[PDB]
Each structure stands twice: as structure tokens, then as C-alpha cells.
Amino acid sequence: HGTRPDLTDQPIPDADYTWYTDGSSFLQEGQRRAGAAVTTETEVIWARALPAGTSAQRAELIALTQALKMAEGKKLNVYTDSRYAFATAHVHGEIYRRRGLLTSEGREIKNKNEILALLKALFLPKRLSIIHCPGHQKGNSAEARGNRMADQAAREAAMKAVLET
Numbered sequence: 001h002g003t004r005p006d007l008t009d010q011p012i013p014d015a016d017y018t019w020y021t022d023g024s025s026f027l028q029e030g031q032r033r034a035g036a037a038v039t040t041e042t043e044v045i046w047a048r049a050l051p052a053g054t055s056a057q058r059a060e061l062i063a064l065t066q067a068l069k070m071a072e073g074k075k076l077n078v079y080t081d082s083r084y085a086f087a088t089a090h091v092h093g094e095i096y097r098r099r100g101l102l103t104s105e106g107r108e109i110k111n112k113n114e115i116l117a118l119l120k121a122l123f124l125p126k127r128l129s130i131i132h133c134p135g136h137q138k139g140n141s142a143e144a145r146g147n148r149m150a151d152q153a154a155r156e157a158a159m160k161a162v163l164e165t
């Protein structure tokens with residue numbers, strides 16, 4: 001009956017997990033490869049290649065949803081460099097849903113299944129903060145390094161999937 005009331009856009013001090021998520025989509029070998037990743041600053045929690053033709057935005061969505069699922073029952077601070085993802089999570093998703101636009105035949109909305117999955121995932125974490133930071137930062141700050149880590153994780157996930165076959 002609605003979205004998660006306690007969802008916040010700022011870091012919570014006591015969090016169990018501080019993560020970073022990134023999607024990526026490029027054309028490799030005359031084909032669109034995508035990948036998604038959830039990592040800490042120093043280590044990769046989860047990374048996967050995604051079905052061909054997957055957009056960057058959708059990849060972001062999937063990465064985020066994954067972070068949520070893995071964070072179930074715990075306290076999560078998750079950083080995303082995607083304004084699209086951040087917005088969808090905080091605002092657009094719940095509106096689309098409550099409108100009945102997500103389950104309709106209308107393709108005027110993109111990544112409907114991802115959106116639904118995410119809306120469902122938002123309830124898993126005990127306490128949740130989805131924060132947005134500009135990605136690919138020149139800065140040396142922990143969040144910049146986190147973002148770079150995630151980015152590299154996703155891209156590696158895709159490239160690796162391509163050349164293992």
C-alpha cells in the first residue's frame with residue numbers, strides 16, 4: 001500500500017553496509033553488452049553480465065535492485081551515479097505504479113519490470129538510504145572511489161562475459 005516511508009536520500013551513520021552500484025552498456029563485437037555491479041570501496045560484492053541489448057539505465061536499475069536484495073534485514077547506504085535510477089527509486093516508480101502504468105501494455109514507460117522489481121526490493125532492507133553522487137569523479141573521496149570501483153566492476157562483468165565464449 002504505497003512506497004517505503006522511511007527511504008532517505010542521505011547517508012545513515014549506523015549503516016551495516018555502504019555500497020555502490022553501476023550499470024554499463026556498450027557495443028562490443030557488433031553487439032550491445034551490458035553489466036551490473038554492487039561493490040564496496042575496496043571489494044566487489046556482486047557483478048554480472050546482462051542480456052544483450054540491455055540499456056545503461058536498465059543496468060543501473062538491476063544493480064540497485066540487487067544491492068537491495070542482498071541488503072535484506074540489514075541497514076544499507078547505497079550510492080548511485082544515475083539520476084535516472086535515483087529519481088525512479090525516490091519518485092517516478094511509485095507514481096507510475098499507482099497510476100497503473102507499470103502493468104499496462106503501454107511502452108511509453110521504459111524498464112517497467114525492473115521498476116516493479118525495485119519497488120518490491122525497497123522493502124527488504126531494515127533501514128535504507130539511496131544516495132546520488134555524480135559518477136566518474138576526479139575526487140579522491142571514498143564515494144568517488146566507490147563509484148569508480150562499481151563502474152569498473154560492471155564493465156569487467158560485461159567484457160569478461162563476451163570473451164569467455
Ligand SMILES: CC(C)c1ccc(O)c(=O)c(O)c1
Pocket residue numbers: 022023024056060081082135136151
Ligand atoms: C557515457 C556516460 C555519460 C555514462 C553515463 C551513464 C553512467 O551511469 C555510467 O556509469 C557510465 O559510466 C557513464
Ligand SMILES: [Mn+2]
Pocket residue numbers: 021022023060081082135
Ligand atoms: Mn552509472
Ligand SMILES: [Mn+2]
Pocket residue numbers: 022023024135151152
Ligand atoms: Mn559507469
